[PDB]
């Protein structure tokens, strides 16, 4: 009989964290045009438009994710609608960290917020929550592979509050992937088990974060004609999804602590 | 023929570690109170001490057959039992205290039971009231047995000297062995956010027994120092462990690990 077990294959198979260095996208430009006062109506819109663009990245991004494949569509395409906020704010934290060192808000190469540009927003205090994070990023010295394994488990960290169509298969996914960071930190149990603790935080205080943000943008979207404040298609489908089930009581926030 | 040297029956009968930390749970274990001397201060602290020295010989012939305790060197058996004993004795004080008073009482001992009149008597309130909210936490968390003794084995391996041990290596893994037994313990039939969650509430109380077993060292080593004058008398073994403990402490060479930061 022919073995169906193929050791070769598991061997060169890469591993879960050296395929998320593989498929993490490109970075993405804003498409921002300086001679445009900067007023909360022009800055907003063009994050927003920046924003679709990044979730046509996230969701191929999405196809790709090791894990991913296993659950149901329904399920996958309600992650993605659930996580998106999570998902684009933790990335601005990191390219802000990697890029200038927390210093400013790294939106995109041709879109970096100082503070007067937080001001200009008209969201200063929330341009401030996410520079928050990325200032936690630089006391935590975080790691490439730390962050791209945390981001799965942003995408994977709200769920609808009936549930989804397969609990088990998203917990399984959840598990494995909790699992790669708890081996990323790893002998000092004491320090290893330190840092896990650290980094779950972390995680956990993306709720706060994430609700104070989709509490603005639900806000901007209801009043966009009076704010003059312009979403692209892309983020039209997903607020339209998401709003009424936020707002509802649908989403179930996912904690370690 | 030749001889297997590997038993499959052996293998398949061996109990696993949380069936064997159940079976070696020591006996409770009498004070010899008397209730027709004065609860003064005296009396009651010397009570409480002689039964830490009947405590000590039970922990002793339990460190013997604890799994994976004889892979580590013997002087870092020792060690873990001088540095370790005031929190083991605690954590039990507050195990007993929740299965057989539903945590309203200190139950020292079936023979001695503190209500608030006898933790105002043995001047030392506070740190009763600091053991009571032990207890407090376990009925709040619904603490189960298995969860209990693999949690006193990890206060055993919770302190260490600032130098290190004889062999730093085979005590990392004996301590891992049994944060892995906490970690499937606390797995329910699955949910991560649950599992987590609990885990999560077990490290914080492993963690907070440091700041609680300091200050109880803190007022054993007071009494030790001035014995004579306060009549607080000391048995064999409690003179031995602080006689090792006291100067190791004070001087700093007490390690504490934690889970959080
Ligand atoms: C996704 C986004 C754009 C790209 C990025 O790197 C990080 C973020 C996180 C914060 C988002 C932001 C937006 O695009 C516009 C938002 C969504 C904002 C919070 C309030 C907001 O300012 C709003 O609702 C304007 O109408
Ligand atoms: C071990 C012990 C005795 C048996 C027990 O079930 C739990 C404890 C924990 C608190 C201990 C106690 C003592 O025996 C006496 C102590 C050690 C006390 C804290 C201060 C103390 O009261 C003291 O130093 C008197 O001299």
């Keep these: 009989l022919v073995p169906q077990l193929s050791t070769i294959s598991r061997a060169l198979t890469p591993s879960p964290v050296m395929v998320l260095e593989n498929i993490e996208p490109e970075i993405v430009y804003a498409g921002y045009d300086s001679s445009k006062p900067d007023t909360a109506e022009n800055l907003l819109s ?12 996230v969701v191929k991004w999405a196809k790709v994710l090791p894990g991913f494949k296993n659950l149901p569509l329904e399920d996958q395409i309600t992650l993605i609608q659930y996580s998106w906020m999570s998902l684009l704010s933790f990335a601005l934290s990191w390219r802000s960290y990697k890029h200038t060192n927390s210093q400013f808000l790294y ?21 401030q929550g996410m520079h928050q994070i990325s200032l936690q990023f630089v006391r935590l ?13 942003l995408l994977l960290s709200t769920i609808p509050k009936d549930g989804l169509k397969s609990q088990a298969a998203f917990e399984e996914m959840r598990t494995n992937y909790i699992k790669e960071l708890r081996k990323m930190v790893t002998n000092n149990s004491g320090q290893s088990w330190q840092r896990f603790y650290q980094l779950t ?57």
């Design 46 to 57: 063009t994050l927003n438009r920046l924003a679709g663009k990044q979730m046509i990245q």
């Design 107 to 127: 939106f995109a190469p041709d879109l970096v917020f100082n503070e007067e540009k937080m001001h200009q927003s008209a969201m200063y205090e929330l341009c």
């Design 141 to 153: 010295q975080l790691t490439f592979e730390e962050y791209t394994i945390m981001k799965v488990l």
């Design 201 to 257: 935080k972390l995680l956990d205080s993306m709720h706060d974060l994430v609700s104070d943000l989709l509490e603005f943008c639900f806000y901007t979207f209801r009043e966009s004609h009076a704010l003059k404040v312009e979403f692209p298609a892309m983020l039209v489908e997903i607020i339209s999804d998401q709003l009424p089930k936020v707002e509802s009581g649908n989403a179930k926030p996912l904690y370690f602590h």
